[PDB]
C-alpha cells in the first residue's frame, strides 16, 4: 500500500470514516423505515378481530387421535399398538374434566340441551375476558365416559373424536329441514346442531364399516350452537369447543376401511382440494 498518500485498501483513513458513516446511516435509516412501515401496517390489524377471514372461511374438521397419515391400525392383543393413539386422546381430553372446569369466574354452565348461540361480547377492550361454556366429559358416552372401558377408549372397535376447527366470530347455521338429509332421521332438532354423520367413502365397498354410533350433547349428533361464537384465545380462556365422539364397532377385521365424516350446514362448505375442510378421511384396520 503506497506509503505515499495513505490509500490502504484503496482509501485513506478520513475517507474510511466517511464511507463507514455513510453505510451505517444508509442501512440504519433503511432498517428504520422497514420496521417503521411494519409498525404502521400492524396498527391496522386489531388484536381482537382478523382483518380478513378468507382462508378459514370454510371451517375445517380434525380427528382427535391426531393420526400420523390419516390411518389407525392396531392390535387389540398388543397394548403398544394403540398406545400412542389413546395417549393422544387422553392428552387432549385432560382439559374437559369437571376438575378443570372449576372456576365460575371464567367458566359458566350452559344448558345440557342445545341452545341459541350465546353472543357474549362485542370485540372491544371492555369488560375484560369472557366466560366460556362448559362441556362435560360424560356426554362422550362409552368413550371417555370416565369409566365403562373409558380408559380403553374402545380398544376393540375404536372410537374417535370429531372436532370443528375454531373460527373467530363464527356462528354456524345448520341446514334447513328441506328434505331428508340421509337415512330417515327421526332426529330433527334442526336449529342448534351441526349434523356430523360419518360415512363410508367407498360406495362399491358394501360399507363393511358396520355400526357407527355418535355420542353428542343430550344425545344429539352435532355441535351445540350455544358455544359458538369464538372470541379468540385472549378474550376466552381455554375455550372448551364442542366435541363429538364416534364409536365404530365394525363387523370387518384385518380389512382397511376408508370413511369420510362430513359436516352438513348451509354455512359450512367443503372442497375437493381440501380433504380436511368440511370432511374427514380415516383409514381404520383392526388387525388380529
Amino acid at each position: 500500500w503506497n506509503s505515499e498518500k495513505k490509500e490502504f485498501l484503496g482509501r485513506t483513513g478520513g475517507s474510511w470514516f466517511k464511507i463507514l458513516l455513510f453505510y451505517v446511516i444508509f442501512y440504519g435509516c433503511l432498517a428504520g423505515i422497514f420496521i417503521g412501515t411494519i409498525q404502521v401496517m400492524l396498527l391496522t390489524i386489531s388484536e381482537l378481530k382478523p382483518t380478513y377471514q378468507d382462508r378459514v372461511a370454510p371451517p375445517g374438521l380434525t380427528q382427535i387421535p391426531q393420526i400420523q397419515k390419516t390411518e389407525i391400525s392396531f392390535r387389540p392383543n398388543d397394548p403398544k399398538s394403540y398406545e400412542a393413539y389413546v395417549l393422544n386422546i387422553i392428552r387432549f381430553l385432560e382439559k374437559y374434566k369437571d376438575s378443570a372446569q372449576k372456576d365460575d369466574m371464567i367458566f359458566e354452565d350452559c344448558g345440557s340441551m342445545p341452545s341459541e348461540p350465546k353472543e357474549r361480547g362485542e370485540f372491544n377492550h371492555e369488560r375484560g375476558e369472557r366466560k366460556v361454556c362448559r362441556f362435560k366429559l360424560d356426554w362422550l358416552g362409552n368413550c371417555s365416559g370416565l369409566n365403562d372401558e373409558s380408559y380403553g377408549y374402545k380398544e376393540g372397535k375404536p372410537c374417535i373424536i370429531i372436532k370443528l376447527n375454531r373460527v373467530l366470530g363464527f356462528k354456524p347455521k345448520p341446514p334447513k329441514n328441506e328434505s331428508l338429509e340421509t337415512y330417515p332421521l327421526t332426529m330433527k332438532y334442526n336449529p342448534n346442531v351441526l349434523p356430523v354423520q360419518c360415512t363410508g367413502k367407498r360406495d362399491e365397498d358394501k360399507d363393511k364399516v358396520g355400526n357407527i354410533e355418535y355420542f353428542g350433547m343430550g344425545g344429539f349428533y352435532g355441535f351445540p350452537l350455544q358455544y359458538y361464537p369464538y372470541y379468540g384465545k385472549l378474550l376466552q380462556p381455554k375455550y372448551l369447543q364442542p366435541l363429538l365422539a364416534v364409536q365404530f364397532t365394525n363387523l370387518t377385521l384385518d380389512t382397511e376401511i376408508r370413511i369420510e365424516c362430513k359436516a352438513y350446514g348451509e354455512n359450512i362448505g367443503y372442497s375437493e382440494k381440501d380433504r380436511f375442510q368440511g370432511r374427514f378421511d380415516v383409514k381404520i384396520e383392526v388387525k388380529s
Binding site: 412501515t37 382478523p50 382483518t51 382462508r55 378459514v56 375445517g60 391426531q66 376447527n165 384465545k233
Partner: protein, 986 residues
Amino acid sequence: GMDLDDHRLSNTELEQKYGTNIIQGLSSVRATELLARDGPNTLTPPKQTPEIIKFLKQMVGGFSILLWIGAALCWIAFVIQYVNNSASLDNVYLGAILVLVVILTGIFAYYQEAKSTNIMASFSKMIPQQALVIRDAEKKVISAEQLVVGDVVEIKGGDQIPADIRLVFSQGCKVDNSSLTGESEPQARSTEFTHENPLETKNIGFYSTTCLEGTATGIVINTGDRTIIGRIASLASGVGSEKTPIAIEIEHFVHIVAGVAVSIGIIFFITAVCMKYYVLDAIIFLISIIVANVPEGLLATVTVTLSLTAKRMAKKNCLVKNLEAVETLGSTSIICSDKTGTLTQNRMTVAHLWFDNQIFVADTSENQTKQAFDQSSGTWASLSKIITLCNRAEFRPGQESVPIMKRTVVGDASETALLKFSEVILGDVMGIRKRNHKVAEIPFNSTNKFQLSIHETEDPNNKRFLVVMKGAPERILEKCSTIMINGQEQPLDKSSADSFHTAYMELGGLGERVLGFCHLYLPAEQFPQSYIFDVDSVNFPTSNFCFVGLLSMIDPPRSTVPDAVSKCRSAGIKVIMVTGDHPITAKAIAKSVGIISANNETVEDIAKRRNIAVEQVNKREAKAAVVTGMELKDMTPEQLDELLTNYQEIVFARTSPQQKLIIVEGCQRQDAIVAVTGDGVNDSPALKKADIGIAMGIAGSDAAKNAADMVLLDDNFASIVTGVEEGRLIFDNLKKTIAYTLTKNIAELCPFLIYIVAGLPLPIGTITILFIDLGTDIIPSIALAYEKAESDIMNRKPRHKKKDRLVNTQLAIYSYLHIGLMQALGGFLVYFTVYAQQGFWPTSLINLRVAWETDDINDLEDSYGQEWTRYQRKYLEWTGSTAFFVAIMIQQIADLIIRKTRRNSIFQQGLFRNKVIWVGIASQVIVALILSYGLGSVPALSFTMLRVQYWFVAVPHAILIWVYDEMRKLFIRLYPGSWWDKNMYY
C-alpha cells in the same frame, strides 16, 4: 517458407543452386522428384471447426456452469424422491425448466459469436490455373500446381503469374503488385538488380499478380504457401481473431456474478449443515440460491439488443458480420488505416493547375467544374485544347447514365485523369477531338517520356495545322521557346526559367505527378494542308515550341474522409496511417485529411527548414513522424513502442502486408483497442488481427471484405464517427441493463436466505422467481437498450481497455447492496402484511416453516386462536409468494426508471421521452396481471389471486427507491469528483 530471397545471384549462379538450365528447363524427372520433397503448388485451405462442436461449445457459456449444477441437483433431489414418495413434485419440472433455459440461452449465444473465415473465396479468383513452363527443352502448358522451385516459366502479357518467379529474360514487362501494395500503378520489371529487398527488385515476379504487358522468362523461386500471397493467406486465415473486446467484458462479468453466487452458496450451505439440516435440505437450498443469483435472461436479451442494432446499423449502410462488432467500434483507441480506397478515392484525378506562373485548385471529389477557370481565358482556352487533343485514352461505352468521374476508362493512369478533367470541364471532348481531326500520329515508348500529335483544326475558315505535345516537365522547357500569356505568345525569359523549376519542385513535393503541355501552330507557308508528316521523325520539329500550361494529379481523398477523421481525432482517438504507397504521396495525403496538423513538422520538414543534418536534430520536437516500411525492418519492437508512445501523428509507408500486422500488434500491446480500415489483399492479415476490421464495400478486395467485421456498403468513411457514437452508447446502455437485472437478484435471494435461517414460510417459490427473470423483465431489459447518454460521449476520451471495465465494484455493490436490499425490504413488508391480515402476525411466524410444511397438522393455531387446515396454509403460502413477486416488480418499475439515467434526474432525460421503457413498464404490469390476479393463477404454478390492495403495498418502497437514487444523482451532478462522484457513481 523462406523470405530470404535470391535476386543478387546471376543466372549462372542460381542455375547451380536450383539444379536447372535456363534454356533447357528442368527434366520432368527432377520435376517429379522435387515435387515430392516440396509438395504441390497450392495454398492449403484453413481449418474451420465443425459447427456442431461450436454449438455444443456454447453449452458451457458461463452461466451454464451454474445452471448445469442446478438441474443436476434438481434431479438428484428427485432421485431421493424415489426413496420417499412425493406425488405433487416440482423437482422434475424445475430441473426440466432449467435445462430448457440452458439450451435456450445457448442457441442465442451461438449466433452472437459468429466467425466468417471464408478467406480462400477471394484468393481463388487471382490464382492462375495454367502456367507456360518449359521442361526438358519441350514447350508444354501445364497446371500451375505441378510447378516446383527452379523450373523455367514463360510469363506472357495479360496472364497471371504462375508462381513466385525470378525473371532472367524480359522484354517490356509490366506487372500489377496491388495485391501487395494496394495500387494498380503498374510496376515494370527488368531482368536485373534494382533494390536490396525483394519487394520491388524489378527482377522478380510475384504469385498471382497479373501480368499487364510484355513477355518474361523466369525461374520459380518459391511455390505454394511460401509465396508472398501464400504468406498473406496463412496470416489472414490462420491468425483468426477469435478474441473480441466486447465479450471479454461480459465474460469477466459472468465470472464475478458466478463468483458471488458460489461464495454465498457455500456460506449458506455450511451454515445449513451447522443448523442440523440433512444434505438433501441444504442442496434444495443451493438450487434456490443459484436460481436467485444467476441473471437468467440477461445474456439472452443482450444478443437481442446487439442484433437489433446490428440490423439497424445495416440499414444505414454499416454491415456487421459479427454481432459483437457493433460495440468493438468505439471504446477503440487507435485507428490504423489504409490510404488508397479507404482514405483515398483510388481514382487518379487532377488537383493543381499552374499556368501564367500562377497556381490553381480544381475539383477533386465527385464534384464538377470547381476552379478559377476564368483568369486568363486565353491561356486556359488553348490549354483545354492541348488537354483534350493529346490523349489516347477513351471512355468505355454505355456510360450515358453514369457520372463523369464515376466512369469506366480504357487507358493509362495519367491520361485518364486528364480525360476525366476535360470531361467535367468541356462537355464532350470526343466532339472536339473528332472535329480537330488528328492527321499525324506518334508512337509512345517508355524511354520516350513525351507524346505528340498534329491536328488540322476544323475551324470553318482557318484550317491551319496545330501540333500539341505533352510529356514530362523536364523535357518541356528544354524544347520550348515562346510561352503564352492571355492569347499573346510572349517569348520566355530568365525569370520564368528558374520560376518554372521552383514552382514545379514545390508542386511535386506534395506527391503530385506533374505533366507539362506545349503546342505550336505551324505556319501555312512551309506546311500547307497537303503536306504529310512521316512517322519516322523526318517531317516535324521537336524543339522551340510554345509552353501552354502545367498540371498535376494526386488521387484525392474521399469527399468526407477529412471531416470524419477530424471528428475521430476530436473524440480522443489516435489515428495512424499504414499503406504501401511512397512517403511523398503519403505525407501529403496525411496532412490533407486531418492526420497531420499544419504546424507539426516531421524530422524531414525541420531538417529542411533549419538546413542542418537530420542526425544532428533530435526526435521529440517533431510531433509528427513518417516511418518508411524499410526502416521498420531494422526497427526493434522496443522502439516501435518508443515511437508509438512519443508521437501521436504517425504514418507508415511502403509497408509490407506483414508489417501491417506488426504495427497493429504493436498498438495492441499498448492496451489499445484497434480498428483497421482496408480495401485490399495487403490489408487482410492485419484486418483479422484488429479487435475490429472495417472494409470498403465496392472499392475493397474480397479478401479484406471476408476478413472484416464491418463492411461499409457505400465506401462512406462517415459511418465510422456514428459507429463510434453508437458503440459507446451501446456500452453505457449495457451497463444499465446489467445493473437492472443484478439488483433484482438480491430481492429474489433474501426470501430463501431468511427461510433457511429464520424458518418463516417460503416468501417466494423458486419456480416463481423464474417468472420474474424470464417474463416480466425481458421487455424492460430490452427497453433500457434504447436509452440516450446524459452527456455527449465525444466530449470524452475512449475507455481504457483494462482501467474502466463493463462491470466494476461500484456498479456491483450499488446493485447488490444498495437497491437489492431496499427491494427485498419492500417485498418482506408485503409478505408480513399478507400474513398479518389473515391472523399470522409478524412476531408469531418464526420457526413455523416446520409445522407449516407438516401435512398431518390440520389445526394449526394462529395469533387469534383460529385453527388452520394444511391446504389453507398452503394457499396462503402461495399468496405470500405472489405478494412478494408482485412487490419486487412494482419496485422494478421504479428500478427501470432509475436505471434509464446513470448521471442526472429522470426529468432531464424525461420519463416520457423513451416510449419503449413505458412498453416495459406496461409489459411488467400486464404480465403480473395475466399471472396472479387473474386466470392462470387460480390453481397453478405457486400462484394465487391477490387482493387488489396487495398490488399497491409496494408503492411506498418504490417511491423511496427512486427518491434515494435521484438524490445521489443530484449530488454527483452538484459536486463532481469530491467523494460522492467517486463512491456513488454507477
